[PDB]
Amino acid sequence: TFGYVHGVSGPVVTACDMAGAAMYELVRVGHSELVGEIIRLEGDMATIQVYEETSGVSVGDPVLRTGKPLSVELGPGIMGAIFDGIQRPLSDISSQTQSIYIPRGVNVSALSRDIKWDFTPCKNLRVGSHITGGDIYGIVSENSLIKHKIMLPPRNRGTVTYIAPPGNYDTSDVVLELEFEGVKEKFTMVQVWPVRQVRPVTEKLPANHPLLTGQRVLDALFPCVQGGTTAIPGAFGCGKTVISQSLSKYSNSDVIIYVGCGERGNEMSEVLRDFPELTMEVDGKVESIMKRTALVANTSNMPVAAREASIYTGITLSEYFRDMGYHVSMMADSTSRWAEALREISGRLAEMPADSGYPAYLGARLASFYERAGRVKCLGNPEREGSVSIVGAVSPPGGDFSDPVTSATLGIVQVFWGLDKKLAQRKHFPSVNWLISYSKYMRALDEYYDKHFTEFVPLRTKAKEILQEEEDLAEIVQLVGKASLAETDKITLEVAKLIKDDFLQQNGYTPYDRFCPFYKTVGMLSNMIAFYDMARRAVETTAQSDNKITWSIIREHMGDILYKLSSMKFKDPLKDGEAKIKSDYAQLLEDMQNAFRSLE
Amino acid sequence: YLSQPRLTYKTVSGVNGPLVILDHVKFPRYAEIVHLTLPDGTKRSGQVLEVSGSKAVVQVFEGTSGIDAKKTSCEFTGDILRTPVSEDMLGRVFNGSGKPIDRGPVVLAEDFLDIMGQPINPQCRIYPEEMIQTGISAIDGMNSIARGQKIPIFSAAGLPHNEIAAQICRQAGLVKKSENFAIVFAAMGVNMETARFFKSDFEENGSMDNVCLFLNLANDPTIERIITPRLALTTAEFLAYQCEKHVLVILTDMSSYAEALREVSAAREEVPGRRGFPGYMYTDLATIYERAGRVEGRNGSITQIPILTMPNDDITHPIPDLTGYITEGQIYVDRQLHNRQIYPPINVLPSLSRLMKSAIGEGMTRKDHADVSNQLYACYAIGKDVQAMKAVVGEEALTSDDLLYLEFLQKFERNFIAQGPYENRTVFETLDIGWQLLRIFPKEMLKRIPQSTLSEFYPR
């Protein structure tokens, strides 16, 4: 049960006398009992990586074998909690230490064993029933919004012997008892799951329902879904924080798990300060977002081995809340700073790199994490249906599209929102490329649009065609200079400029363009494309007749119709409403129809 | 109190580069400190990098020249490197290992502090929002700096990064609406005239009463540069979080530190990183850069301004690359602007400050700060993209407004950027010059400025 330290070099310890230790087991190193993980066996020597600082660890110190892998505790007390990569409560540590530091070997439990939770069992369960893994056997009222379903661990089954009456219990009180084969087993409100081990489901279903970000360029041209995998770049000022906060304030998610992997210490203080201040509107009332949010916090100076366990902690919390029947949306910021830790740990073990120093198993570890997202039919007796949507921020090492992390990621994800540096230099936000970005969900979303917004797909198609034709013409107008241009090219240019400046371009720091609902998006695009069609038809039919129509005698006639289009983005979906905005757009459509009928 | 006697081994079993290997050590502790006594009688100090069984691998701070394998005595301390710390350290000059070098006594300790630090709970920090008015338009106007930030100066060889550093140190204060900074200054591998420059500049402007210097010159041992930025950051942490003052830490040539890191990693036969630097250089620079900010309940702060020199003016080298992943922005000193007699030669297109958005605006500096900065940046970018093809294809094929961007280029590089090595501009003077430059364009070409701001500030 006790080995001894034999060598120490960096975060890697070598311990002798470790006979039956298993790989990836957890151990306690030294007199401070620092947690560590077995990453190599040889004879009866074991190689451990330590999740703390190893300064001052002598040769001969004890090493205690725990017998279990790296796990998380899952129970009531996760909504509103701030952890690190190992699920250590950063607020309980400060409250109990009364200090501004995190001690070494600090051993405090992730969920407080002191709070009394209001637990009511299920009505039809009773002594003698048959229960299996996944079944919901109680409900704890965690707060005003989130109801915490108490489930059975997925590897248990039996007949009920005792189940607790409604009341107030803490996470140490026994609530259920099962008998399988004459053996007995008691269950409390908390379970324990290994973070590197995926959680079972009944079935994985296809993703068919959108995930509204609020941005027009992403909701229209490059949609995400509930259960999708997305990759954005980590770029300051481009509009990434807008997305991170929009996922939380105004979306269709129930739970939000935000993971920071390698985080500038002054950019994590911002997140930790102004997340407890954000609010959202539910049933008229205004309620804090920290009632349905959990943060995993990891900065760039914490141990390297705790940097790579952050992603797993976050995705396991996500799966735990998915198995209740909720829709979770995880944000994993700086997947690149996670790959950096992978590379460093690989180097410390003297392994052969593959490309640019990275381990050869880089794609195999990114896939194992991205492929845990999806829409599922939850395991257990009540028919549920959950989903986890992962968004990963892959920062560039200068802006290369063939970084090993970026090229390994593009083989796995279904949506890619690209970064345009030329657009971020001209202060066009959000700086989405819209010519290299892609989404592979635009065919699974078809029967949703064909049922709710039945006229949107042609608008999207034509908008994309216009935006590509403009790019074709741009590097022609650059050299020659727009003298000899067909009138249809003039209309293409001057409608593409409208689409770029008034539809794709958005300002998240204003009280009307913070979250743009989808009826607003569809209405703006519909009016713009209707104008394009009308102008093109007018100029095309009277081509060889008398009084040749041109783009210049269109900007004369309808100069204020070209202003209600360039100002559709100022309507407000909370000062105005849905029917008011729809009426305005319909009136503008009739106006431009009358103008094009009169001029022609 | 460690009261047991110390153990002294005459059992050296190898000298190689900066490292000495010992056998028959009794329970070797990791990161321990060792005192070496050479045959003639001189004394050096080292730190244990790796223990394994009975072996210990010490790195000697002052080199391994003169050391043999039969008569050198290594005495083991039993403790990690704890430096003595006090408030009298202000006004004193030390060498790269903390010894007095100004004819003064050794530090009488108020405390002994571990030089690796102590991790600060991320929940006990405070977000920095107090702008520092450095008096430099290129920084104040477009790359503002909050009090508690970490923002380096990306420079090159032969460029005036010491002049910019000294001007910031001399002029830094808070934005005047109605004391001042202590300074800690570590120098890693500088020449004698750079140290002379900095000492003279500090003591000619009455500051020396409030400055602590740690100096490692280019004629000094190379392995000291590893502990130099950590004794300078352990004093700054005592002053700020125990004596409650506002500290400004300058770290000159964070490139020499990384070269010493590579030199120690290459002698240990480790799997190299990119360009030969150690594979753990990210986790190593992050334990230096992340010792900066404000904490809850204590009225002290630490601002950090490292100073790099990019090899071959390359910003994708490992050192600038990894430094950018850790610090909150960068100030970019350009060579093309230097060769045209511009001071300070700051290129604002790859410069950035990530804490600016929350330190400027109404009630902090002025309501038009962010829009003026954004429009100036966009105009400079468009003007560069014009000037490229203007020089390439056609001085007369330029449009009527493709000549306004070139006039903006000239007047912006000569009137906004170019400042003067002793000129202290307010923030509002910087903003007024920005408006005088933006008035070149008709108000229809300023798309990055709202109408409410254009109506109030453009017509003057």
């Binding site: 003297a350 052969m352 | 036969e269 799997v271 190299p272």
Partner: peptide
């Protein structure tokens, strides 16, 4: 290439002489 071949050579020297 040369650095990685050096690391491998040192590995296969250590393991054989030890």
């Amino acid at each position: 290439f040369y650095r990685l071949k050096k690391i491998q050579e040192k590995k296969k020297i250590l393991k054989e002489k030890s």
